[PDB]
Design an enzyme around this catalytic site. Structure first.
Site, short mmCIF file in Angstrom:
data_model
loop_
_atom_site.label_atom_id
_atom_site.label_comp_id
_atom_site.label_asym_id
_atom_site.label_seq_id
_atom_site.Cartn_x
_atom_site.Cartn_y
_atom_site.Cartn_z
N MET F 31 -44.39 30.15 -49.11
CA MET F 31 -42.64 30.33 -49.12
C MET F 31 -41.79 29.56 -49.73
O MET F 31 -40.96 30.24 -50.40
CB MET F 31 -41.77 29.81 -47.24
CG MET F 31 -42.89 31.03 -46.68
SD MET F 31 -42.01 32.48 -46.69
CE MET F 31 -43.66 33.53 -47.06
N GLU F 36 -37.63 30.32 -49.25
CA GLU F 36 -37.53 30.67 -47.67
C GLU F 36 -38.12 29.70 -47.28
O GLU F 36 -38.97 28.49 -47.05
CB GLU F 36 -38.04 32.17 -47.67
CG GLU F 36 -37.44 33.04 -47.69
CD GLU F 36 -36.72 32.91 -46.50
OE1 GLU F 36 -36.22 32.95 -45.85
OE2 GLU F 36 -36.36 34.64 -46.83
N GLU F 44 -39.74 36.30 -33.74
CA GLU F 44 -38.65 37.20 -35.21
C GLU F 44 -39.65 38.00 -35.95
O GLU F 44 -38.69 38.64 -36.10
CB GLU F 44 -38.62 35.88 -35.24
CG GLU F 44 -37.23 36.28 -36.40
CD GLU F 44 -36.75 35.15 -37.26
OE1 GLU F 44 -35.38 35.23 -38.24
OE2 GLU F 44 -36.96 33.31 -37.25
N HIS F 52 -36.10 47.53 -39.05
CA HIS F 52 -36.34 47.78 -40.62
C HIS F 52 -37.55 48.49 -40.84
O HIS F 52 -37.45 49.15 -41.94
CB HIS F 52 -36.42 46.94 -42.16
CG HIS F 52 -35.12 46.38 -41.17
ND1 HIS F 52 -33.68 45.98 -42.26
CD2 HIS F 52 -35.15 44.61 -40.81
CE1 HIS F 52 -33.10 45.25 -41.80
NE2 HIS F 52 -33.51 44.64 -41.12
N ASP F 55 -35.06 51.40 -42.60
CA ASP F 55 -34.69 50.66 -42.91
C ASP F 55 -34.83 51.61 -45.02
O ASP F 55 -35.82 50.99 -45.19
CB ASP F 55 -34.42 49.73 -43.29
CG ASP F 55 -33.20 48.91 -44.51
OD1 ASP F 55 -33.04 49.55 -44.72
OD2 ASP F 55 -32.99 47.84 -43.61
N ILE F 91 -46.53 38.27 -52.48
CA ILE F 91 -47.18 37.22 -52.02
C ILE F 91 -48.59 37.47 -52.55
O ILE F 91 -49.48 38.71 -52.18
CB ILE F 91 -47.56 36.31 -50.77
CG1 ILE F 91 -45.59 36.05 -50.53
CG2 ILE F 91 -48.03 35.77 -50.35
CD1 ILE F 91 -45.60 35.97 -49.53
N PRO F 131 -43.06 28.20 -64.55
CA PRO F 131 -44.17 28.51 -65.86
C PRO F 131 -45.48 29.35 -65.27
O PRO F 131 -44.76 30.62 -66.72
CB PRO F 131 -44.10 27.77 -66.78
CG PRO F 131 -44.84 25.85 -65.50
CD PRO F 131 -43.37 26.49 -64.69
N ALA F 133 -46.40 31.51 -63.07
CA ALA F 133 -45.17 32.84 -62.84
C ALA F 133 -45.03 33.72 -64.10
O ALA F 133 -44.53 35.00 -64.32
CB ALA F 133 -44.54 32.82 -61.38
N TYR F 137 -44.83 37.27 -65.83
CA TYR F 137 -44.21 38.16 -65.70
C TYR F 137 -43.03 39.64 -66.88
O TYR F 137 -42.97 40.16 -67.35
CB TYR F 137 -42.96 37.79 -65.16
CG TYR F 137 -42.70 37.78 -63.73
CD1 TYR F 137 -43.43 38.49 -62.80
CD2 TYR F 137 -42.35 36.64 -62.96
CE1 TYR F 137 -43.72 38.07 -61.60
CE2 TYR F 137 -42.53 36.22 -61.23
CZ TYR F 137 -43.27 37.05 -60.76
OH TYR F 137 -43.47 37.27 -59.54
#
Lengths: 170, 168, 170, 168, 176, 176, 176, 168, 170, 176, 168
Positions: F31, F36, F44, F52, F55, F91, F131, F133, F137
């Site tokens: 997380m 998060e 929850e 959703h 959605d 993830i 770094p 990640a 990217y």
């Protein structure tokens, strides 16, 4: 025939009804489309639990095999009339059971519900059914022209009736 | 001169008044003396019901003349039941044929229906004859179908097809 | 024409819409039945308040007279297309306003909603409307055979379109 | 051998699996990779929706072969959109013509419809040709109608009428 | 004049203000500053307002003068209480646009954010083609932290925006 | 190996996957990559999942191998259909972390975004202190458009993040 | 006079009549004829009225003159459509009590029961200490079928009532 | 002269106005600038909440002077938190002691409570001293308890018991 | 101690909590009544699923035995404060676990939730607990007089606190 | 034998008894004693049972032996607490019909009515063509108070019924 | 040996059985023969009702011995009504005094109540005497208060105060 019994439709009978209501040949006798998911069937059953304008019965033999169904619909509080309809399951058709089922429905109508008139509709292209209903005391009161679209064209039906007095005076 | 239009909430008192005339209600085989609130709540319940079209008839001054309805509309069999009421004060003014034809026009040219049928008491031969003039023909003589005014009465069931109306 | 404005439909406009939706001639252009109670209209309006797949506009002049309506419907999240439809109120028909309303709808579609394609349907028996749409940049992509039952028979319609690139490159 | 029957809840895993094949879903212009729970809740929402008939196709051993659907059924214009999927493992076995004809039979002999139409990518000429063999004809060539696999694609809109099917 | 600016006061948006908001949210020019579509029925506006009355992740304020004329609106959205950040947005009412009140509205919003709500970071988005606003935010202590490429479709093309921020420490602390 | 990578396939998240998600959403380390809080009861999680389902502003996908082992998750959030943008997040399941599958999961997400959903822009947030990640990217064609200062409170201090993006035109088009 | 009686007409009870009903239902003397407690808030009355609008087991009618003055009420309750029976009850409005209209109201109710609703049996209950009513019902063709002992507590003691009935055959048929 | 009475819906605009004064709201450690609709909907939510008693203070001419509240009433521990606001235009008129005593009277002679407590900023020594005159004593000095006006502030927690109030 | 872990409370843990919440001795430390049906417990759990103002944790050892609970309640959005509370199950009391649980709660408060202040209440008649909290960095800020009715009389409590800066600067 | 009769005990009907009730309510012969139509789906039965759990105007009891075999049912309906009256009805389970338990079930119902619920009057309806039941009720102290003409349609014709009653004073008091 | 604990759903069959003993139910002046489903739905309705505490009594082997309840708890007047049932098979084993004292302990040391009262038939002098031994005293002799077993009966109302229980 004396071993055939009518009882109220129950939730556990709905898989039997589902088979009938998806059978093209059977549904043609009811002027109906042969398409009904189990969920449509069950949700409509739920919706009408307390509806006093219909009585839906299943027919069982002495071994509790499901033979067919009989229904009284459009039961009217003032005019004391109702429409009769019947299905015999394919495996039990042609055994001579229909007369008994018709008579049980009339007995219920006239000795329990205190109705004045039972009527039915039957395709003019089913003369053997017309003749069976006549044997049971029904008489033609209409020849309805191009009433229903059934199997690719508009078809005519007989409307037939019997009154309480005639039935109880047999 | 006369216009057909959809029933609206403001027209309900007119309908309620007609419903307190037992002779008028007997023409429809409907129980008279319904509460205004039953009528209004049924109107509310059926706002989105695609199986009926209820019309009122008005003159050029917006006086309500009558009612015309197409009910039990079935879109596989392509059939519907027709009914008409002209208010007592406007009966005998020659309106009915025109209104019947306008209802058939709506049925056959807008809703694309195949068959319109109606029920009429056999003891109302003037009405039978008017419907015949409009192209309806008897297809049934229903025995003791309705309890009306203290006895069971017979009714004619009468019909017209789209092909006959359009002259096909 | 520069004085005509589009704005969102509001509840206070519904009596204007009700008059249009019960007019046989007007509804024929929309392939629709001319029957809608005020309650059906208002309850459908309520149902679609948060529906992102449509935008309904009323058209007003400088004095806030209601001139007509324009709508974009079936707005699609992936394909970036929508259907255009228009009504000019009978009293304002034939004043040369339609071109302006069409252009305002395309402006909204292509400069605000970032749509790729706007399409429309128009009866082949309305060639003056076909020609107006062509003047506004629409091109025929289909001739749909007996698509709609309108006034007693099945009628053909043109399907016409314009793309964002063509509109923005004018 | 092959039977058409109404879609049932127990068939939803079959549909879900087909929905995770982007090539199959592109034939319907439908977004792939829908959750099982979205599919199930949409099935629940539309149980009583009279504007669609969704069928599955099964063989004699109850293996699920494919899907046939009639959607956007309009009972004034009497039209509907047709779509068909045959599962990859059953494609090329000669089933499709028969299934198309059975869907048209249902449309024209049971639902009493006037027109069935479909959409097919112009880059799928084998499918265009199969539909032509079944009596469909092109009525539109829709330009850049759908974004499919990274570009806007053109589609044919094709139709058949009740009169043509019944040979009237 | 600071004497006039000092008379501008904050209060929350309420239901009776929604006709004012409806005018703003259907104005193409105004909504372009918010990267928003200028279409909102009164019913959509009101139902969304009702839904969010108790939503702790936003604040919607109006700024009014001493006579209760509505001068503009300042809002915080996407308030996060772990990261202690929120996005700021502002509209000046058409009748009061171009009168030099903007700094005062921003000051009221930053004072509220940093002295009352105890947030750590306020950020905003502003079009690169709206240099007047960029320059006002710079005067207020905001600094660019991003140049977002083709972020928003506005008036027929994709446009770039600056993301700008200010921290509570910079706002509250003396550095001289 | 590309032979193994090619066997990884997309499907949507469903209710039966929620025990897997619950493990991820209560893992502090995992997380932290999503900025998060690592606390979420099963109730929850499930109630939010239910809310959703329909959605249209999000997509939640799992990536699975040929044996239906769940390798990771890729999601799009805040999807806007006028601006045609969305935020991407990823993830990898603990058992499959560090095995070199990440590029394949990103490829599946970008292919879906740009060839199926017809979006114009995908953006993401990544910590400057992550770094590995950032570099992945960059290999995928993402470019920095912001350096967000003290954006997130993570593990006892405020941290900076890069905002990075890629456009549909760059993804789809040949430039040589 | 029959000329005046002939001008009395039936219609259903509606919401706008409820203030009239409220006056009757809170009148001790009137409610004693119905064996009822004379206490009913307007809210209890209205909520019960709403609940029963669509209830097919009752009918509530008012009788009005040509000027729409409400003369009384006639009701059918406990309508059973197999046995085809119902209980009849009547109230005359205080201003019109003792004017000789009662027979006309009863006639309207029996005509409706037997010529419109197609019932077989109408029955009623009437206190033995209310001979005026017993005698009126006898004139209308009702006959005693029970003498119910200590059936109702009325005004501090238990009282006996007659149960009286008339059949559709007797009402409709000529016997001479 | 001054009367305490239950808060009513018609008093909500008075409360809302006080809530737009940040100095007044800081005395209660409550966030200022709440919408009228949030205030009204919270009032609605708590109509039957037995854990609070909210009063307004009025003069003989029905002018609203202020507010007095007992909140977090716990009926096992028999404690509650007290708060008071006097509107700026009525501050410094000598009302406060009387109102404080009336709130304690309500707490101890009607609700049968054991302990009333309050919180007051240490930087408001005049208020501390007024509460001391009314019989409250410090039981805590809460360090950096509340963020008020740009910094964390300390507060006194002060209390009085039923026995002390009744002189037992 | 390094093997003890905090995790979110789950529905499957509620029978463990029920045992604690009906224990007179344990509930005295929380100033609470020892009476709570399973249905009250579960319905309150349901009511607070999405309540952002609390975090309820269970404490497990390496074998997943439930050791106790830690909660942060009254978490305040502006003031950045919360109240801490703890229970160790009777069978695990006196094993030296409490320090670790307190430290895990402070870690969560100050490194994850970004809180400024954690406070607690503890009876003055529990001086060993006061001393444990002092060892963990808490300091007395109040001595609340006759605050709670506990076991037949009104009892005094210490209010104790620690700030984020002190914890993070250890 | 009184030794066996004395072992029969009362308890309320509960949901687990509904399959037993369903059998009775679909039996033509049994329902004829109650003037009822013999048709009731399990769903109609259960939903009505649920609706009336808290309805104070009825009581539904089963009578069981020492082994918990269900011997029959006794009910009170239309309980009125001003008039202090109720209607009594009884069914004996098919397997136990004709064994002489009926008096005991009636005794349990009257004891409950008059010693527990403190009612003043219990009444019942019984067909004139069912003299066995009439005679049993007479033995129990019930007396005819009405002979209701063509009250019910049963098995193809209208039938007459007796209305019979007993008062609490007669039940409780010694008269010798 | 004996423990008092909160009533739980699993204990409802025990309560239901006691409710089918008219002699036991008469001690509480409660109507016997309640359906299990009425009992269960009332239990559900009152889960969060702060005005009652219903306990069951169990032995060390978890056999249910009886019930003890505090009802009509009022937190301003600080009073409650006490009731106790011991199952017939466990009556006369000397449990009652201990259970009564434990209920008073709960009332006075946990709930902080001022007064506990009870009602007992005057024709049950053994019960009157047991309550007197536990410190209760008569404060009323209520004439024809309850209809029990075919006649109106008189009851004693008896009470004990917190001060008496704690020896103050």
């Amino acid at each position: 025939n004396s071993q055939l019994t009518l009882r109220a439709l129950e939730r556990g009978d709905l898989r039997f009804i589902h088979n009938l209501n998806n059978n093209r040949n059977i549904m043609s006798y009811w002027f109906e489309e042969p398409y009904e998911s189990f969920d449509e069937l069950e949700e409509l059953y739920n919706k009408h639990i307390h509806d006093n304008a219909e009585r839906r019965f299943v027919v069982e033999d002495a071994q509790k095999n499901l033979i067919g169904l009989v229904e009284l619909i459009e039961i009217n509080y003032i005019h004391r009339s109702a429409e009769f309809q019947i299905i015999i399951a394919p495996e039990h058709q042609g055994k001579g059971f229909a007369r008994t089922l018709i008579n049980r429905a009339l007995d219920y109508s006239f000795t329990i519900l205190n109705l004045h008139k039972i009527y039915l509709h039957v395709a003019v292209e089913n003369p053997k059914a017309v003749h069976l209903y006549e044997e049971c005391g029904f008489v033609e009161e209409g020849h309805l022209v191009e009433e229903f679209f059934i199997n690719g064209r508009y078809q005519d039906v007989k409307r037939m009736y019997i009154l309480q007095s005639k039935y109880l005076n047999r």
